[PDB]
Design a protein around this ligand. Structure first.
Ligand SMILES: [Zn+2]
Ligand SMILES: [Zn+2]
Ligand SMILES: [Zn+2]
Ligand SMILES: [Zn+2]
Lengths: 220, 83, 833, 196, 103, 243
């Protein structure tokens, strides 16, 4: 009773904290709030996954209904057993082939997503969309437009995007000062296919561990 | 039954290994375990013991070791205060 | 369902034959009936409901209705134990009970300790040791005082043992003054008696732990032994026997007090009183000091020799014990024993009437074997040759046992050629002439033949003549007996280089392999196993490739031992002879085992799984995996799990590079049970490879991606089991970045309930502690370490308890503790030089 | 118990389903996408469907759809009656009039148990967008129905004819609809249904 | 044990003695009951040996064991090897209801 | 893509020089057919281990033994009524009694019995860091800085035999400075300074223990409270001539 009503306000607790935004309303009933704020707000600690205080047993997810059953890592998919055995609604293969897939072909191979120091998987999360996202931030760059989005845009080949004219009056993108586009800052004769422009960088090892040779263990 | 066994193993592991936070443990009880284990390792490794000896600048190293031993008990602060 | 109605005990329940106190009152007795008389599926539920609600129901009605049930004579060992289990679970649940109901329960479950079976003795001990913490010292002491004064020998015996179990549960230091009360009590005679026996069962239950407590008890022995009551004096002498044997030679310094009156009791009271006294002193003999041992042994041996003629059973049993212990004394010489003790031993105690009663035959044999150490082995067996050729079959059995235990320890190397001949002659005689059905003769005979081997050849031939002679016989008992003897004698024949003789053995046994009797057929296949294992395959007569196709139908013989020795031998051909049997025949083997392992035997099932390693080494691993994965789809759990084991062993012998890709597809299959079998097969295939998984770890993580994320607590469970072995054996390889991922998916599962899920996840996180190191694993544990939720806290302090158990110094640098974080901190961490 | 129906997995990227709800997820279990409930066996699935829980979620989903924006015992001899179409005209436009004749107490002598016997024939305008064959379409039909006899249709290419404007003085006995009361007559004594 | 829950352990400081297991239980790591790559022989406190009880299988507590029990390499790294004296003091509900079930 | 994955090869060029433990026993008999002399010493720094002789009045490297790959937290020689071999306690809790032997053309260190204790780490419960042996070599005693103390009764035979551990457990008493008193074979007696872990005031109290070979357990004898200023204990052998 008295101890329950003795609690300091969470904002009174914020001042003790160097990173006050992590502390939350429920920290008021922390039996040792001044300590718990220091631990929770300590540098490298990773806050408890928030699926607690929910009674849903951490997975009720509607998204769980729409998750793909599985996908082979493409290196293993090269092994062709996908066609040999149909998992969807004998199969002998070469020892050298399989062994080389894991070792010769797949030594340097690593899953593309993984996760980071403090990455924690909440129920509603799905990594796959973020994998295509990270891969997409990689492939796609300004000045280039795929033929699909080009067809939807109804832009014929050899013709500049509609924002090149408004970009002539307004100016180059503030975010891309080094961006070049045919007809304006960049040679129109170099206009080719899906690329109407490219960023021209103005910036222009061994890491003590350079192996200088790569030799995998041989099965034979 | 299973959880009930985990209670008994909680009593046994707590007996052997001393401080193990069960569910509710006061910060005074637990921080004492922290201090005791940290000092325990500082004096336990001849390495870190040699290190604290020099950085502290004591005349002998066993002064630092038995210092840590004494520093394990809470009343040693007031003991230093009474010197 | 209320299966198996009990008319009398149900009409004893009354209650509902067709108001919260009436509802709990009714449903409670209804559940009790569900446990006692009901359906297994029903009673299993009533147990969980009765334990969950056990705190809700009043122990007054619980025990009021429950306890008197066990007072009837119509109870059965099944049902009485079904109620006993509820007694244990409820007493350990409520944890606090009033003294009258404590007395009631202790009286009810008290007789359980006296029951003939240690099965009931155990649970009878469990109820009492659980009740002890509930009631406490003072309550139980107030319970035993009015009972020890009872005039009933039965009940006094009961609460003697019960009081002992209490003394062990709460410690004998707290209950010891009570022992001094009933011990030293001048009032009642039976109080003295039982007060002494309680010391007996305390000594038995504590075992070696009686040492530190032995001071207070020997007070009761020394003061209460002097009582003029003969039964008291006897029971004290038995207490000296138990506390000396459990004592072990340490306690002599304390026993020196009671050492003196034993002898003046011996030289005077004689009789059964001297039986108990010589039991006590005999138990004192090993703990005696070498000089004192020298004196008191020489003092006792005269009384022993004089008492050789005792017509009584008990005194003879004691004498054999005293010789048994005194044999270890260095003072008495083997010359002394051979000149006096031994000749007056073998003639007196080996009379045929001795062999008639087993419980005496035990002490006779063990005593004789203890004599064999000091005595010359050739002299002992020399005296043991005449009892072998006697016409009494049980006397021949005891005669065998003595040879077995004697030759195992010493060996026959002491025997001369002549009596060595007469030995094997006698063994063959008694072996071929044996009337009774017993398993000892081939075992011990085999032990002799293993002891002396090169010397056997001229006997080795006739022994095998008797072997075949019994291999053709009309009694399956002698059949399987002789076959068991064959399998034992096979390795010895190799030492004589008789190998063609092993070939004709292989012939005859292989031809008799078509016998109808399974019990003999299994032993025959065992002899086949020893033969094929010993002798080179190329020179085997049948040959092997002809042997195995006759074995393939054997697997369906059901029973047990047939598949035990059959799977053993098929495995032997699996590792030894890859080439002989054709690969299609090996595939027939795979199908047969795949059907066979539904059997309930863990030996048949485990060895069956092990043979797939040899079959996978000989034949196509993919060929095996087709059948295995096809069998994963079956609903039966033993099939799924032990096919997963087979996949694991095949992945061990073949290597994961073959097995894993197809496994991952079998996981791509949508079926749950199949995915489970996949994940477990992945666990086992990883635990069987210590250094292999390091290169395979990355290809696993996208599979565990859908596993740990899956909604089913089963898939999350078995995936965590994968992370256990994978993390333990891959720890320190440098894959921590992958381990970081795998953990990041685990942390949300910490709050998941259920015992299996919680322990699998705990073990998984502990495996991650080794692969990541505490620091990051810590960081999670810290940011969740206290927390308000009272639930989150209880959950994470489990992981932090295990972490504190495995690692302490490892966590020392990683405590997030700063001078503002805690008051005292440590002044020495900030020191920089 | 499955009645031989094939329930495709959720990930198979949708043949019409009986109930487009119960699916099988990546695992073998069966689920109700709306209810988000897992079911071990098809019997449990049927308990779910017959349960009030699922129904409530169905009504909630129908409310979501609105937010996003006697039939058994029907006698049927399927007998084509005789229609008498005729181009009419009044004032000020052109309208159609149909004269449908019915049995002459030939077979209606065995059924007279006041079972909708008082109910007159009914007309409705149906779009050809839905047919048992679904081949061609794009025009309306003035369907006319009576319990025993077989339905009858009349194609109306003209977008609008005789579609009047407040013919009577707004009297509200809806009967079935404005169409029926507005422009139909049922000579029940002679069994002649006129429509215009 | 890892599987049967009600089984209680000893957990005292192990002595020089080595625990025995029967041929029936042969091959199991007494903690995890694993058959793979055993490492170190089990050691039990003297309080679990003494007389006849020393001959019992430290796993199933009933049969008389010939063989020595070894910890696996996973328990030897998890440190459960050195935790204490493994033994099963109570026979367990499984074995109990088995014996009472048959007879 | 080239995997960075720096692969480092660790070598100890010069081995740890701070000598934390020593023992006086005579281990190997070298260069002499039959010789028995108590003058020799073996000294250990954590991992690294060395064995020196004098016999000339000038110390001599004997052999630098192989790296043990552990933290030796105490080392004491034992002499039993024979070649004197040293009892060695380290991390893993194992009490490892090792004899230095001559094998092939070099001196190698052979282990006889290692007894598992506690777990593998440097711990306070770990019965290490305080060790001593009966000066007559009848028993070895290990203790912990805090929790518990274990004493083995050592016996020699055709094969060495370590008796079961003798346990004493005092929960809150932090142990420091184990010092064992020599005896005439009467009974082994060891002495410690126990500082209470949980107390309102700082209290450092000496405590005596007599291990009873008769009753086979350690017995608390005299608990004497001394000022908190206490440092260490040493054993006065007899005072048999005085009272
Ligand atoms: Zn639904
Ligand atoms: Zn034990
Ligand atoms: Zn066993
Ligand atoms: Zn293990």
């Amino acid at each position: 009773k008295r101890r329950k009503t003795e609690k300091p306000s969470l904002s009174q607790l914020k001042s003790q904290v160097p990173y006050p935004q992590i502390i939350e309303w429920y920290d008021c009933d922390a039996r040792y709030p001044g300590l718990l704020a220091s631990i929770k707000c300590t540098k490298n600690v990773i806050p408890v996954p928030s699926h607690w205080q929910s009674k849903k047993e951490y997975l009720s997810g509607r998204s769980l209904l729409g998750k793909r059953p599985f996908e082979l890592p493409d290196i293993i998919k090269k092994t062709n057993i996908e066609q040999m055995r149909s998992t969807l609604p004998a199969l002998d293969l070469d020892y050298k082939k399989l062994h080389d897939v894991f070792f010769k072909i797949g030594a340097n191979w690593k899953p593309d997503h993984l996760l980071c120091f403090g990455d924690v998987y909440y129920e509603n999360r799905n990594l796959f969309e973020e994998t295509n996202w990270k891969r997409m931030v990689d492939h796609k760059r300004p000045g280039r437009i795929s033929q699909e989005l080009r067809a939807i845009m109804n832009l014929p080949e050899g013709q500049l995007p509609p924002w090149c004219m408004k970009m002539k009056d307004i100016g180059l993108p503030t975010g891309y000062p080094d961006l070049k586009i045919a007809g304006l800052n960049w040679d129109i004769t170099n206009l080719k296919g899906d690329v109407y422009g490219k960023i021209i960088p103005n910036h222009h090892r061994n890491y003590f561990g350079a192996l200088i040779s790569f030799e995998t263990p041989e099965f034979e | 039954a299973e959880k009930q066994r985990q209670l008994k193993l909680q009593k046994i592991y707590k007996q052997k290994y001393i401080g193990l936070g069960d569910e509710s443990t006061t910060r005074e009880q637990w921080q004492r375990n922290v201090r005791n284990d940290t000092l325990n390792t500082l004096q336990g490794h001849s390495a870190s013991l040699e290190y604290v000896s020099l950085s502290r600048g004591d005349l002998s190293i066993r002064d630092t070791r038995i210092h840590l031993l004494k520093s394990m008990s809470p009343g040693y602060k007031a003991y230093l205060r009474e010197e | 369902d209320l299966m198996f109605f009990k008319p009398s005990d149900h009409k004893y329940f009354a209650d509902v034959i067709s108001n919260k106190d009436e509802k709990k009152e009714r449903t409670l007795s209804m559940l009790l009936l569900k446990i006692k008389n009901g359906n297994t599926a029903s009673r299993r539920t009533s147990m969980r409901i009765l334990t969950d609600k056990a705190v809700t129901f009043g122990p007054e009605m619980i025990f009021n209705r429950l306890l008197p049930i066990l007072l009837d004579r119509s109870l059965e060992d099944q049902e009485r134990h079904l109620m006993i289990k509820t007694i244990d679970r409820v007493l350990y649940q409520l944890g606090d009970l009033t003294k009258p109901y404590v007395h009631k329960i202790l009286v009810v479950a008290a007789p359980l300790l006296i029951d003939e079976d240690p099965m009931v003795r155990s649970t009878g001990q469990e109820i009492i040791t659980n009740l002890s913490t509930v009631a406490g010292l003072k309550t139980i002491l107030t319970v035993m005082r009015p009972d020890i004064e009872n005039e009933d020998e039965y009940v006094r015996n009961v609460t003697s043992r019960a009081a002992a179990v209490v003394a062990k549960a709460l410690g004998v230091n707290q209950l010891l003054p009570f022992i001094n009360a009933a011990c030293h009590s001048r009032k009642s005679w039976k109080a003295r008696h039982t007060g002494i026996k309680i010391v007996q069962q305390i000594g038995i239950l504590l075992g070696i732990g009686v040492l530190n407590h032995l001071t207070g008890l020997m007070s009761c022995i020394k003061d209460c032994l002097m009582d003029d009551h003969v039964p008291v004096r006897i029971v004290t002498a038995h207490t000296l026997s138990t506390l000396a044997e459990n004592s072990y030679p340490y306690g002599i310094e304390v026993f020196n007090v009671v050492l003196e009156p034993l002898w003046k009791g011996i030289r005077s009271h004689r009789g059964k009183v001297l039986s108990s006294f010589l039991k006590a002193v005999g138990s004192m003999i090993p703990l005696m000091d070498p000089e004192y041992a020298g004196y008191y042994t020489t003092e006792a041996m005269r009384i022993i020799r004089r008492e050789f003629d005792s017509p009584d059973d008990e005194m003879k049993k004691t004498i054999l014990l005293v010789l048994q212990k005194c044999s270890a004394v260095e003072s008495i010489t083997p010359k002394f024993l051979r000149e006096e003790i031994a000749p007056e031993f073998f003639q007196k105690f080996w009379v045929r009437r001795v062999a008639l009663d087993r419980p005496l035959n035990k002490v006779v044999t063990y005593t004789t074997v203890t004599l064999a150490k000091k005595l010359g082995c050739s002299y002992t067996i020399d005296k043991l040759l005449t009892p072998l050729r006697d016409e009494a079959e049980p006397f021949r059995t005891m005669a065998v046992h003595a040879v077995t235990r004697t030759v195992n320890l010493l060996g026959t190397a002491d025997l001369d050629e002549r009596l060595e001949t007469r030995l094997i002659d006698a063994l063959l005689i008694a072996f071929q002439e044996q009337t009774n059905s017993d398993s000892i003769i081939f075992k011990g005979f085999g032990a002799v033949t293993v002891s002396l081997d090169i010397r056997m050849k001229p006997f080795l031939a006739p022994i095998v003549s008797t072997i075949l002679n019994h291999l053709k016989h009309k009694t399956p008992l002698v059949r399987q007996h002789a076959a068991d003897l064959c399998a034992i004698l096979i390795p010895v024949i190799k030492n004589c280089h008789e190998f063609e003789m092993l070939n004709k053995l292989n012939i005859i046994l292989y031809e008799s392999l078509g016998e109808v009797y399974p019990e003999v057929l299994g032993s025959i296949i065992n002899a086949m196993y020893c033969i094929t294992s010993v002798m080179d395959l190329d020179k085997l007569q049948p040959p092997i490739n002809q042997i195995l196709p006759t074995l393939t139908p054997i697997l369906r013989n059901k029973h047990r031992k047939v598949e035990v020795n059959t799977i053993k031998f098929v495995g032997l051909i699996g590792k030894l002879a890859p080439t002989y049997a054709p690969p299609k025949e090996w595939m027939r083997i795979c199908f047969e085992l795949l059907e066979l392992l539904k059997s309930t035997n863990k030996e048949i099932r485990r060895s069956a799984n092990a043979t797939f390693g040899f079959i996978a080494e000989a034949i196509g691993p993919h060929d095996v995996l087709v059948a295995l994965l096809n069998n994963l789809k079956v609903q039966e759990r033993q099939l799924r799990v032990c096919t997963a084991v087979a996949i694991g062993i095949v992945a061990k012998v073949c290597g994961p590079y073959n097995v894993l890709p197809v496994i991952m597809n079998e996981y791509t299959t949508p079926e749950t049970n199949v995915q489970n079998g996949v994940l477990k097969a992945m666990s086992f295939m990883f635990e069987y490879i210590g250094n292999m998984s390091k290169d395979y770890i990355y290809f696993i993580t996208p599979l565990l991606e859908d596993a740990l994320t899956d909604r089913d607590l089963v898939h999350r469970q078995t995936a965590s089991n994968v992370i256990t072995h994978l993390a333990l054996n891959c720890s320190g390889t440098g894959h921590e970045d992958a381990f970081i991922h795998l953990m990041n998916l685990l942390i949300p599962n910490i709050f998941e309930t259920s015992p299996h899920a919680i322990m699998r996840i705990l073990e998984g996180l502990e495996a991650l502690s080794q692969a990541l190191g505490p620091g990051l694993f810590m960081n999670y544990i810290w940011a969740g370490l206290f927390h308000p939720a009272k639930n989150v806290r209880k959950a994470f302090w489990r992981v932090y308890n295990n972490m504190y158990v495995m690692y302490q110094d490892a966590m020392v640098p990683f405590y997030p503790v700063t001078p503002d974080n805690n008051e005292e901190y440590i002044e020495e961490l900030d020191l920089v030089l | 118990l499955s009645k031989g129906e094939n329930v495709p997995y959720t990930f198979q990227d949708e043949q019409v389903r009986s109930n487009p709800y119960i699916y099988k997820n990546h695992s073998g279990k069966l689920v109700c996408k709306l209810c988000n409930t897992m079911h071990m066996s098809w019997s449990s699935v049927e308990r779910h469907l017959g349960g009030k829980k699922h129904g409530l979620n169905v009504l909630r989903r129908g409310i979501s759809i609105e937010k996003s924006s006697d039939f058994r015992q029907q006698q049927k001899i399927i007998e084509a009656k005789q229609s008498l179409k005729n181009n009419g005209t009044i004032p000020g436009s052109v309208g159609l009039a149909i004269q449908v004749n019915y049995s002459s107490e030939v077979k209606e002598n065995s059924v007279d148990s006041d079972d909708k016997a008082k109910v007159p024939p009914l007309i409705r305008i149906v779009s050809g967008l839905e047919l048992s064959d679904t081949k061609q379409k794009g025009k309306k039909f003035l369907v006319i129905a009576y319990e025993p006899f077989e339905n009858i249709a009349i194609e109306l290419p003209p977008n609008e004819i005789l579609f009047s404007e407040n013919n009577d003085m707004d009297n509200n006995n809806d009967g079935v609809d404005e169409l029926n009361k507005k422009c139909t007559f049922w000579d029940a004594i002679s069994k002649l249904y006129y429509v215009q | 044990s890892r599987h049967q829950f009600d089984l209680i352990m000893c957990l005292k400081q192990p002595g020089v003695q080595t625990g025995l297991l029967c041929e029936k239980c042969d091959g199991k790591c007494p903690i995890c009951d694993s058959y793979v790559r055993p490492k170190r022989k089990v050691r039990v406190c003297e309080n679990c040996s003494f007389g006849k009880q020393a001959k019992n299988c430290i796993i199933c507590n009933l049969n008389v064991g010939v063989n020595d029990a070894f910890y696996c390499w996973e328990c030897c790294r998890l440190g459960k090897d050195k935790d204490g004296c493994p033994r099963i003091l109570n026979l367990g509900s499984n074995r109990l209801d088995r014996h009472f079930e048959k007879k | 893509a080239k995997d960075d994955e720096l692969y480092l090869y660790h070598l100890t060029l010069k081995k740890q020089t701070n000598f934390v433990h020593s023992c006086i026993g005579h281990f190997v008999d070298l260069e002499a057919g039959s010789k028995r002399e108590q003058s020799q010493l073996c000294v250990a720094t954590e991992t690294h281990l060395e064995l020196y002789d004098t016999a000339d009045g000038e110390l001599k490297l004997i052999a630098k033994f192989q790296n043990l790959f552990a933290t030796i937290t105490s080392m004491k020689s034992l002499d039993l009524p024979w070649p004197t071999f040293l009892a060695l306690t380290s991390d893993s809790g194992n009490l490892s009694i090792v004899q230095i032997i001559m094998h092939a053309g070099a001196l190698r260190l052979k282990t006889l019995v290692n007894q598992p204790l506690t777990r593998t780490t440097l711990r306070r419960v770990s019965p290490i860091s305080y060790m001593e042996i009966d000066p007559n070599g009848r028993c070895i005693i290990l203790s912990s800085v805090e929790q518990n103390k274990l004493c083995f009764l050592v016996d020699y035979a055709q094969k060495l035999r370590i008796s079961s551990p003798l346990e004493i457990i005092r929960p809150h008493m932090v142990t420091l400075d184990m010092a064992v008193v020599d005896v005439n074979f009467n009974n082994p007696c060891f002495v410690t300074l126990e500082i209470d872990n949980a107390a309102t005031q700082l209290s450092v109290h000496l405590i005596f223990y007599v291990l009873e070979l008769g009753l086979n357990h350690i017995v608390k004898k005299a608990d004497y409270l001394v000022n908190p200023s206490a440092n260490f204990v040493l054993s006065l052998p007899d005072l048999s001539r005085y009272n």
